[PDB]
């Protein structure tokens, strides 16, 4: 049974609710982004309308084999009518194709569902600025003050300088980058670019990247492993065993691996600046954990919410425990009293 926080009242609409069989009354299923927790349940056998971005539609067609007739892609930043209700899709600053959705209810209520997002001050000059929002369905992943991390720019700067230094000292070193879903592509694209290489990967990953409308992508990626000195691997293989094994396969082309594991937040953030980060090393293999987030920090979320001044907030993440729910409601009240809405 679909929980309440995936339902849009006064509509036949749901958001990110494909794992419940047929939903009573739902004439249109929205998908915010192509991450597995959110699409869970979609397959080539699905027979109801799906509304999403163009990029999310490319991935549903080609990766999940949903049939074309059920895929309804919408342009961003454009007022659209769906089943007699005005909607707008906005960029979520999450992974490729990720959107927020604005619903203008027939009775005058305005609802924003963020899906997954990383809040940014640039969102204060979208179509959100134009009018008032009564309900906010909020990505609350990191809704606690201890969740700090740097900008995506500072993290990319670190990674580029790290890779460039190591490979300039040793031209026989190989760089490896972990992945398990779309998002965070900038990590491996920026590293390959400073190294003058294409990024090499499996056929299944190349296919996924081919759906994302990245400009000049054919210049940046390849399935020919041997010609490239930046390789992508599944995240689970980014360990001393998995990397040794991969190094055997390259056939004495390389004598060193430097690898990157993009995580979300980890507690090493509570004590250590990005500049100061060090790897775990075993022999000729070094692994860096780098905190590249595609979710709001506490401060970025607080800022967005105090700017938006919603009348009511419904969290969509960390909703399973009483202590979580209670903690989140406390921060919402502080924020409200500090800004005075």
Contact footprint for Ni ion (CB under 5 A): 35, 116
Nearer CB in complex with Ni ion: 35/198: 35
Nearest-approach distance from CB 96 to Ni ion, in angstroms: 11
Query: Which of 226, 168, 223, 162 lies closest to 191, judged by CA?
Result: 162
- Least distance (Å) between residue 75 CB and Ni ion: 21
Other beta carbons within 10 Å of 264:
14
Q: CB 98 → Ni ion: shortest distance, Å?
A: 7
Distance of alpha carbon 65 from alpha carbon 311, whole angstroms = 40
For Ni ion, the closer CB: 35 or 231: 35
Residue placing its CB nearer to Ni ion in the complex, 116 or 185: 116
Q: Which is nearer to Ni ion, 99 or 308 (CB)?
A: 99
CB of 188 to Ni ion, least distance (A): 18
Rounded least distance, CB 260 to Ni ion, Å: 20
Decide whether 117 or 304 has the Cβ nearer to Ni ion: 117
Please identify, using beta-carbon distances, which residue of 14 and 316 lies nearer to Ni ion. 316
CA–CA separation, 125 and 307 (whole Å): 11
Nearest to 51 by CA among 127, 131, 42: 42
- Least separation in angstroms between residue 37's CB and Ni ion is 7
Q: Which two tokens stand for residue 130?
A: 């134009």
Q: Which long-range contacts (CB under 8 A, 24 or more apart) does 53-56 make?
A: 53/89, 53/97, 53/98, 53/99, 54/97, 54/213, 55/96, 55/97, 55/211, 55/212, 55/213, 56/31, 56/97, 56/98, 56/99
Quickly count: other Cβ atoms within 10 Å of residue 309's Cβ: 14
Structural element, H or E, at residue 331: helix 322-339
Residue placing its CB nearer to Ni ion in the complex, 35 or 205? 35
Q: What is the DSSP string of 18-81?
A: -SSSSPTT-SEEE-----HHHHTT--TT--S-EEE-HHHHHHHHHTT---GGGEEE--TT--EE
State the virtual CA torsion across 316, 321, 325, 328 in degrees, nearest 10. -80
Nearest-angstrom CA–CA distance, 183 and 37 = 14
**Residue 142 or residue 158: which is nearer to Ni ion going by CB?**
142
As measured in angstroms, the least distance from the Cβ of 338 to Ni ion is 29
Least distance (Å) from Ni ion to the CB of residue 117?
9
What's the CA gap between 44 and 278, in Å, rounded? Answer: 45
């Amino acid at each position: 049974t679909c929980p309440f926080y995936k339902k849009i009242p006064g509509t036949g609409f749901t958001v990110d609710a494909f794992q419940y069989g047929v939903v009573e009354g739902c004439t249109a299923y929205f998908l915010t982004h192509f991450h597995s927790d959110h699409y869970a349940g979609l397959s080539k056998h699905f027979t109801f309308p799906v509304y999403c971005s163009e990029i999310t539609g490319n991935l549903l067609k080609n990766k999940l084999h949903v049939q074309e007739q059920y895929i309804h892609p919408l342009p961003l930043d454009t007022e659209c009518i769906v089943n007699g209700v005005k909607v707008v899709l906005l960029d979520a600053n999450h992974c490729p194709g990720a959107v927020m959705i604005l619903f203008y209810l027939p009775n005058g209520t305005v609802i924003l569902h963020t899906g997954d997002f990383r809040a940014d001050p640039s969102m204060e000059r979208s179509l959100l600025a134009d009018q008032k929002v009564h309900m906010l369905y909020l990505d609350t992943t990191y809704c606690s003050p201890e969740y700090t991390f740097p900008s995506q720019q500072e993290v990319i700067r670190f990674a580029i300088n790290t890779a460039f230094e190591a490979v300039t000292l040793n031209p026989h070193a190989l760089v490896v980058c972990g992945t398990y879903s779309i998002g965070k592509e900038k990590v491996f694209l920026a590293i390959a670019d400073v190294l003058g290489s294409k990024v090499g990967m499996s056929q299944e990953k190349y296919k996924t990247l081919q759906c994302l409308n990245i400009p000049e992508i054919n210049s940046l990626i390849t399935t020919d492993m041997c010609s490239s000195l930046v390789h992508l691997l599944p995240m689970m293989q980014i360990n001393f065993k998995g990397l040794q094994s991969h190094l055997k396969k390259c056939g004495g082309k390389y004598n060193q691996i430097l690898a990157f594991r993009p995580t979300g937040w980890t507690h090493s953030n509570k004590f250590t600046r990005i500049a100061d980060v060090i790897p775990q090393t075993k022999g000729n293999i070094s692994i860096y954990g780098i905190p590249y987030s595609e979710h709001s920090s506490y401060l970025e979320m607080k800022r967005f919410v105090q700017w938006l001044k919603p009348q009511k907030i419904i969290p969509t993440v960390n909703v399973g425990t009483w202590k979580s729910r209670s903690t989140m409601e406390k921060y919402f009240r502080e924020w409200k009293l500090e800004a005075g809405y």
